[model samples]
Target: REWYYGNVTRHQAECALNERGVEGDFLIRDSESSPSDFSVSLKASGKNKHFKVQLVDNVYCIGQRRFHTMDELVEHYKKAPIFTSEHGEKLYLVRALQ
Candidate 1:
C-alpha cells in the first residue's frame, strides 16, 4: 500500500481509523530499512485511501478534519449517516462512514 506519512502514534492511528467505520491494525515493521510510520488502507466510493501516521503533539488528520485527541476523533466519525428517505433518500460523504 502507498504510505502517507503523518504525525501519529499506533494507538492514535488505530483509534482514528476505527472512528471512520474501519476495523484494522497498525503494525510496525522489523526491517531497519523500513520507515518509522504507520500504514493503513481505507476504501470508500470504490477508492482506497492509504496513509501513514507518526506521533506529533498527539494529532492526526483525515480529509478536512484534524484530530488532537482520541475521543474527539472517535466521535467525529463514529456516527451513522443521515439517510433521509423523504426525497428518495440522500447520502453525504462526510456522514458516510468509510
Candidate 2:
C-alpha cells in the first residue's frame, strides 16, 4: 500500500486521520535547521509502523519517492492506499516505492 500526506502542519495531518474515522495521537519534531522534517509512528493490531520524512535539497522524501515540494507530498498521501484492519477498521499506510 502507498500513502501520502503532502506537506501539512502537524494538526492537519492528525485531522486527516480523524476525518478518515481513526483516532490516534501525533508526535511531531521540529528542528531549527530542518523545520520541514517530520516523522510519524502508528500503532495498531498490537504492532507499530513508522514513516520518516526529510526535506533534502528542497525535496520532500519519504523512503524512495521524491516530491518537489511539501504540497506534492501532502497530495501524494491524500491518495495513499486504504486497508482494512483486522478489527474491520479502515486505515492507510505509506507504501514503500517499488
Candidate 3:
C-alpha cells in the first residue's frame, strides 16, 4: 500500500489520499510519522512578493516578478493543480511543471 504524508490541512490530506486510491481512516500525525515510507512536505509564501513551493517528488518555484502580483498568481494557478493555503492569510499558488 502507498501513502502520501504531509502537514497539510484535512482537505488536502484527504485529497491526496483519495488520489492515491488509499482506503483507511485518514490519520493526522502532527507529532510524528514513519520515516521509512515515501512522504513529502509543502511550504509556500506569497507575502513580500515571494513564493516557495515544494512537493513530494518535485519542487515548483516562482520568484517575485515586478509586474506580477499575488492576484495574478491566483488567476494563473486556477488552470493548474493549485490550491490555496488554509493557514496563509494571503493569496498563493502552486503549479507543477512536470
lDDT of each: 0.33, 0.44, 0.30
Tens digits of per-residue lDDT, candidate 2, 13-59, equal: 44444333233322233333566866554434544444566778877
Query: What are the runs in model 3 whose C-alpha is more than 4 Å off?
Result: 1-6, 19-22, 31-98
Which residue pairs in model 2 clash with each other? Answer: 3-94, 4-76, 4-77, 5-74, 5-77, 6-73, 6-74, 6-75, 7-74
Which parts of model 2 have CA positions greater than 4 angstroms off?
1-33, 68-76, 79-90, 93-98
**Clash count (model 2, backbone only):** 9
Which order, best to worst by lDDT? 2, 1, 3
Q: Tell me, by lDDT, which candidate is best.
A: 2
Candidate 3 TM-score, C-alpha based = 0.18
- Backbone collision count in every prediction? 4, 9, 0
TM-score for every candidate vs. truth? 0.28, 0.42, 0.18
Model 3 has a clash total of 0
The lDDT, on a scale of 0 to 1, for candidate 1 is 0.33
| Model 1 regions lying over 4 Å from their true place | 1-36, 58-66, 70-98
Q: Which candidate achieves the best TM-score against the true structure?
A: 2
Per-residue CA lDDT of model 1 for 1-98, tens digit only, reads 22223432334344445454342222221212344323334423333344433434555443333445322232333321212336533222221123
Tens digits of lDDT, candidate 3, 1-98: 23323343244444444344232222222213433221122233411222322222332223222222222333344332233446643232321110
Error of 3 at 72 (Å): 42
